[PDB]
Write a protein that binds this DNA or RNA. Sequence first.
RNA 1: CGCGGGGUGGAGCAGCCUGGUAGCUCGUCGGGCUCAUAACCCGAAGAUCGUCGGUUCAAAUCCGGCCCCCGCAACCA
RNA 2: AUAAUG
RNA 3: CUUUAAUGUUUGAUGUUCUAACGUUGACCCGUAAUCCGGGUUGCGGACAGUGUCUGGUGGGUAGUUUGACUGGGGCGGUC
RNA 4: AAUUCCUUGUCGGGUAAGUUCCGACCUGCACGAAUGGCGUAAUGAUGGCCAGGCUGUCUCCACCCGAGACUCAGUGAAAU
RNA 5: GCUCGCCGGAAGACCAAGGGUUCCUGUCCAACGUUAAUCGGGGCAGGGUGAGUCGACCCCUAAGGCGAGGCCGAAAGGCGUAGUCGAUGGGAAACAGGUUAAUAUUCCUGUACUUGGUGUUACUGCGAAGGGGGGACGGAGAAGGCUAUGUUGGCCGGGCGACGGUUGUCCCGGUUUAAGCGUGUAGGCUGGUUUUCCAGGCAAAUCCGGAAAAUCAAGGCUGAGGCGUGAUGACGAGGCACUACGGUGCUGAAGCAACAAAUGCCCUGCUUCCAGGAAAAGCCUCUAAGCAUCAGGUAACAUCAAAUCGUACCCCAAACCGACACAGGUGGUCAGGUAGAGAAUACCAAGGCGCUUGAGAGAACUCGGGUGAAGGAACUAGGCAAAAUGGUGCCGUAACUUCGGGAGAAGGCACGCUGAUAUGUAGGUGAGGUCCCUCGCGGAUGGAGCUGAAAUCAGUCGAAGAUACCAGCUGGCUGCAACUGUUUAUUAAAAACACAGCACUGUGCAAACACGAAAGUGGACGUAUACGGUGUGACGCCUGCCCGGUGCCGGGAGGUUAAU
RNA 6: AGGACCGAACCGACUAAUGUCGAAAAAUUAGCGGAUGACUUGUGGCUGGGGGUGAAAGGCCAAUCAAACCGGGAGAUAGCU
Lengths: 271, 46
Amino acid sequence: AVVKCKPTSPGRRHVVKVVNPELHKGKPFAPLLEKNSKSGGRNNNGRITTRHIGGGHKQAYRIVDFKRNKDGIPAVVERLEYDPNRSANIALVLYKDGERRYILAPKGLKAGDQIQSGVDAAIKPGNTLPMRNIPVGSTVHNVEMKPGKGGQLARSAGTYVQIVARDGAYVTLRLRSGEMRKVEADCRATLGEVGNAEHMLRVLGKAGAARWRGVRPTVRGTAMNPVDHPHGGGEGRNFGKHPVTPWGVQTKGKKTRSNKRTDKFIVRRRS
Amino acid sequence: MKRTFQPSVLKRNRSHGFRARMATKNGRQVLARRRAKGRARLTVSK
RNA sequence: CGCGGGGUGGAGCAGCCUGGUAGCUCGUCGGGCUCAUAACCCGAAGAUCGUCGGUUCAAAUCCGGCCCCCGCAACCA
RNA sequence: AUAAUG
RNA sequence: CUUUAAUGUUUGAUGUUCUAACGUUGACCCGUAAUCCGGGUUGCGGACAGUGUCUGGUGGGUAGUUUGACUGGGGCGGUC
RNA sequence: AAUUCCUUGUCGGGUAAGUUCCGACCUGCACGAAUGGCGUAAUGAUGGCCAGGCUGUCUCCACCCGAGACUCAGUGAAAU
RNA sequence: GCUCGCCGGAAGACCAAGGGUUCCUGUCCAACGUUAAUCGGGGCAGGGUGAGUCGACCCCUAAGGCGAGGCCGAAAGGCGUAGUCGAUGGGAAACAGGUUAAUAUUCCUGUACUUGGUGUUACUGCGAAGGGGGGACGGAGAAGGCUAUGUUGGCCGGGCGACGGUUGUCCCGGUUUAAGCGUGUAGGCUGGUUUUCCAGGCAAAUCCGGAAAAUCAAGGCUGAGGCGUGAUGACGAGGCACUACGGUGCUGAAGCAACAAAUGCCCUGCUUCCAGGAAAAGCCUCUAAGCAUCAGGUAACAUCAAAUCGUACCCCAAACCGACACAGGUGGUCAGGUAGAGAAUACCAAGGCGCUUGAGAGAACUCGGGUGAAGGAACUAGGCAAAAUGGUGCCGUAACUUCGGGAGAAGGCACGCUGAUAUGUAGGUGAGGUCCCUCGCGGAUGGAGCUGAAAUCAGUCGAAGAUACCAGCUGGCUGCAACUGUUUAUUAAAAACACAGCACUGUGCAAACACGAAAGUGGACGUAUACGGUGUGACGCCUGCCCGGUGCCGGGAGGUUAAU
RNA sequence: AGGACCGAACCGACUAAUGUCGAAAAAUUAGCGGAUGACUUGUGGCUGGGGGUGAAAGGCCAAUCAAACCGGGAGAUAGCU
């Protein structure tokens, strides 16, 4: 349940934690762990690129099994796990062969549940099979842009894609943005909605809340001097300029989608 | 007051040192200017 | 004190940069319609243009002063 | 279809 | 010559399908105990995309600079 | 009113006496609803203002204790 | 040499960083020291730095640097793979005592310990840049078991004391001992052993992982400290001895108990929470490529080797950094008595110093401060500065509110000493004894001894008992910002900036965007409940009217339009 | 449990005095604010001159920043002192 914190102290009044009792209280399965050092948002040149990030609590990357390469193999989930990088929870599935790999957790999942992968599989949610045996209009997630890619679309918590049309090898999809787009039928997909849909409900509730997320506070452009930012200046919060990015590219209404080659896959524009 | 120069032989050797100059042509230009200058001290050293 | 605009029937507004012969709505007046008023309908009246002078054949029109109104400026020790 | 008031 | 019909020839303007160019930060194999890279199969695109040459447009993100004098100081007003 | 020119607007309160403060009168020179509008508990080396308490802040300063000033000896500057 | 005074969470004792002989001795003093100087971090000369166990070097690894090919780039070069650097990490092992004018866990003495090479002997299948296990991990909080250390008692030794008492419930001093080894506790974790099968672990596998039974209920790991050994040794107060009067030689008693108690250890735990909390080698184990009368592996013993570098001194400073012998800046460790909640603070121990100009005078005035009649903000730009408030226990505490607050609101009472309750209580700790027993560092019973608040009553002293240091001014209206925070280092700590929240907008991943002529990265090993950008700034009540100008977006008929 | 309360170390730099040839090219003294956190700091790196970094002052980047320092154009130029 999404318990609301009592305002016993200032800065806790607005905190709204999303408790998840089902999550295991213990150490992650060791072999799958690997290092994930913070970049700070700097590139190989070392100059800043993605502004207002970095910092936050240390975390280790998990080797989630995107490809679902196993086919026809029965499996049973061992324990739910939280991935600090992810918004969605991950499950430590136990394959019949004894191999263990984390995967994205479907909203309809509990400990000890049975799941399987392969071209056959089942209509039961959490299974991952290529888009051809899939019934039209069923909810799907972890869609691959290309076969063998592993996982791409709708891997975020609370996000899911629904089929609308099936043009042969092409498979039209209703993306969460509402931007319709076809994909290869050969691409694998996992049935059911992604879990942890309550993650959106969290509202942080404190000024330092961005800091452990690796988020850094953003400075308004009007506050900045004209030499540093296109806006700003004046002797009293003067404005009247057309809004823009610091590099001068237009904001609040400036489309930049023009790969051209990939446009053919697009069907209907976002609205 | 905290003086701008806090001594450290290691960091000095890793930047102002001979090998730090040898690492790139720009430092070799510096040493060439040193030998041209005729100064007895080519680079800082122990 | 500086620049820009304005003053016209009872009222609010055109015409006032290319000077020959000032209109609009409302109000007012008279006659209809209603048992009566308002409205509606029809007809008519009302201003020589802030005032005072100059060119110009002729000025509401152009020019100048004065009498007013309005916006803006009135800055840097 | 429009008709306020006494 | 005017006006026009059938076929061939010569090219242009379109809409579709195809592969060999090419793109591949798809998969597999090898160099290879290296996810770089390169090579080999195959998959999805495909004469699109992309870059180069040239040109139109946008363009204070950036650069080079302009922004006159007279003045009972300067500016305003006015004047040349 | 951090916006109010005219102005120390006017009315009321606090003070013996208040160009400030609080409340209100709207004639808003020149507030206005995300360059936000209006409230708001808690919080403040924040702005203004009032009371109690406390005091040499003052009326009016007085005395005492130490470091200098001063004298002697030694060393010995500075701007100009 | 005799006294005074200062720090004593340091102004002490050990290091690192950093200085580079400042260290010790002899000798000298012009110059160096804000003074003189027979003094000295000054001159001159000599001496001093002892390591298998400390550190470094070394094996390995993080951020990150370089970089065989490669990619890209006018040249220079940039990026980056294999690799190899990079401790601020991990990785085998030493303590006690003594000694020098100056060096010691480094020498000596005693007692050990670890990693390798070689030889012999008894046995055995060993074997990779490969696999698995281990290495190997967060904040916070709680409680238990102990230690460092302190106090008291006992014991031992000495004194019985120059103004009154002082053979006693008396005074002073000492009561110190490790690493290692043996035992394996408090406590913590995990159900073990046996067999079979198997798309799992880039190949293989007896290892790990998974699926089955068999079978018993414990086994094993981890783990401070204690008790023995180390140790009939060393150390040890004081005497006894020799003085160049600096010190040396010799001797040497008791060396226990109880209580208090850590921030230190068990704990790289347990619990809880979210912000989910390095890498690799040394280590254990399993095989392949291989090789078996071998080579190797294990155990025991013998023997050899552990090289090289640092080792002085300062180290919160006159030795470092500050042009100074400068109220400055500089990380870590050890850490006591009394009072106190406390590493505050006051006074002391060990220990280090009185800060490199003094001697008189006792004026104005300046600075650091004490007190002050009456008034008590009448001062002033302004309660600026000072004064004052100040602790614990208890009573009591409003408007308002988001119902946590406000609040420690405000405002009062009780605070000393001694005795009694109680020949020191409640409590804590815990011996002797008794008893159980699958006999140990045991479980019960038992309560000596020790430690020891708080409260009530009674008595008493001072003007004042939170008596010193220490140690909130409070209340009311209102502007603003929610709040915590952050900023112009060196005149602006704020209403600004940031803030959670809210909204708009961009983006289907070879993402927008960002650096980079390019490649490539960042975003992100994330991807539409995601992220970037802008605006606003908790929350509560809300957030209209206008698309003309300008910006953005969609549309494409037409007018127009360059290269061609 | 807390960007919780009081209050040292530590950090931050608000008032006044001292001091402006000062002891110090930003201090000290007496009072403050933070102090389990958006904390502080040790060590080693990465980001640099039309750029870096910046909880945004147009600050900070070797006591110098509305464009660092060094050297070279360069004996730049200056209707000016």
